[PDB]
C-alpha cells in the first residue's frame, strides 16, 4: 500500500465578510467517509471542524459543512466571518500513515 | 470527554547538534497508539512516527519516541537545521484522535 495523497484545492484565498468559501481534497485512494477537516491558527494546533466527512464538531458553528464520500471531498463555510481566518486542511483516517492535504490559507480581502 | 493531550515543552531552542527531547502526557491510557507529527513552516504535518515507536519511511534515525499508558517521549538525537518545525503529538486509541498543543523548535 502507497500512502494516501489528499489533493486540496486551492492552496490559499480571500474572500469577503459572509462569503462562500469552497475548498475541495481528493483522495488518491477510496477512503470511504474517513476524512476530517481541520483549521489551524498561527501557532495553535489543528482544531477539528468536520469529521467522518459530513459530521459537525461538537461546538463548531453550522456555517461549516462537508460533503462527499470516496475520492472527492468538499468543505464549505456559507458566510466566512473573521474569526474563521486560518489555514484549513483535510486528512485521512483510513490508513496509517494518517495523511494531511496542504492547506487552504484563508484571508479577508 | 476527549482524551487531553498535554505536550510540553511549548517552544524550546537549542543547537545543531543537541539532543531535544518533548514529551505527552495522556489524560487516561492510550496503550501505544501515539502519532507524533512534523510541520515545517507553511506546510502540513507530516506523519514521523507511529505506534508511540515506529518510524515512517525515509524518517532519519536521528528521530526516536518512546513510551506507552499515558507517557510519551519524543527524541531528536542531533539536532539538524531542517528539523526547524512544529511537532505534535496524537493519541489514537479512542475517537477523537485528538493532538497535543504542539513544540515550536527553534535553533538558538
Known amino acids: 500500500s502507497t500512502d494516501i495523497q489528499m489533493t486540496q484545492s486551492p492552496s490559499s484565498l480571500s474572500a469577503s465578510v459572509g462569503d462562500r468559501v469552497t475548498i475541495t481534497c481528493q483522495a488518491s485512494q477510496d477512503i470511504s467517509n474517513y476524512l476530517n477537516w481541520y483549521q489551524q491558527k498561527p501557532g495553535k494546533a489543528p482544531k477539528l471542524?468536520?469529521?467522518?466527512?459530513?459530521?459537525?464538531?461538537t461546538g463548531v458553528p453550522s456555517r461549516f459543512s462537508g460533503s462527499g464520500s470516496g475520492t472527492d471531498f468538499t468543505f464549505t463555510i456559507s458566510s466566512l466571518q473573521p474569526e474563521d481566518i486560518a489555514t484549513?486542511?483535510?486528512?485521512?483516517?483510513?490508513?496509517?500513515?494518517?495523511?494531511?492535504?496542504?492547506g487552504t490559507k484563508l484571508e479577508i480581502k | 470527554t476527549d482524551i487531553q493531550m498535554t505536550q510540553s515543552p511549548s517552544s524550546l531552542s537549542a543547537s545543531v547538534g543537541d539532543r531535544v527531547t518533548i514529551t505527552c502526557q495522556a489524560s487516561q491510557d492510550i496503550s501505544n497508539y501515539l502519532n507524533w507529527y512534523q510541520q515545517k513552516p507553511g506546510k502540513a504535518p507530516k506523519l514521523l512516527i507511529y505506534?508511540?515507536?515506529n518510524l515512517e519511511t525515509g524518517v532519519p534515525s536521528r528521530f526516536s519516541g518512546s513510551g506507552s499508558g499515558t507517557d510519551f517521549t519524543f527524541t531528536i538525537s542531533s539536532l539538524q537545521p531542517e528539523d526547524i518545525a512544529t511537532?505534535?503529538?496524537?493519541?489514537?486509541?479512542?475517537?477523537?484522535?485528538?493532538?497535543?498543543?504542539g513544540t515550536k523548535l527553534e535553533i538558538k
Open positions: 505506534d508511540a515507536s
Open positions: 486528512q485521512q483516517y483510513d490508513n496509517l500513515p494518517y495523511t
Open positions: 496524537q493519541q489514537y486509541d479512542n475517537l477523537p484522535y485528538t
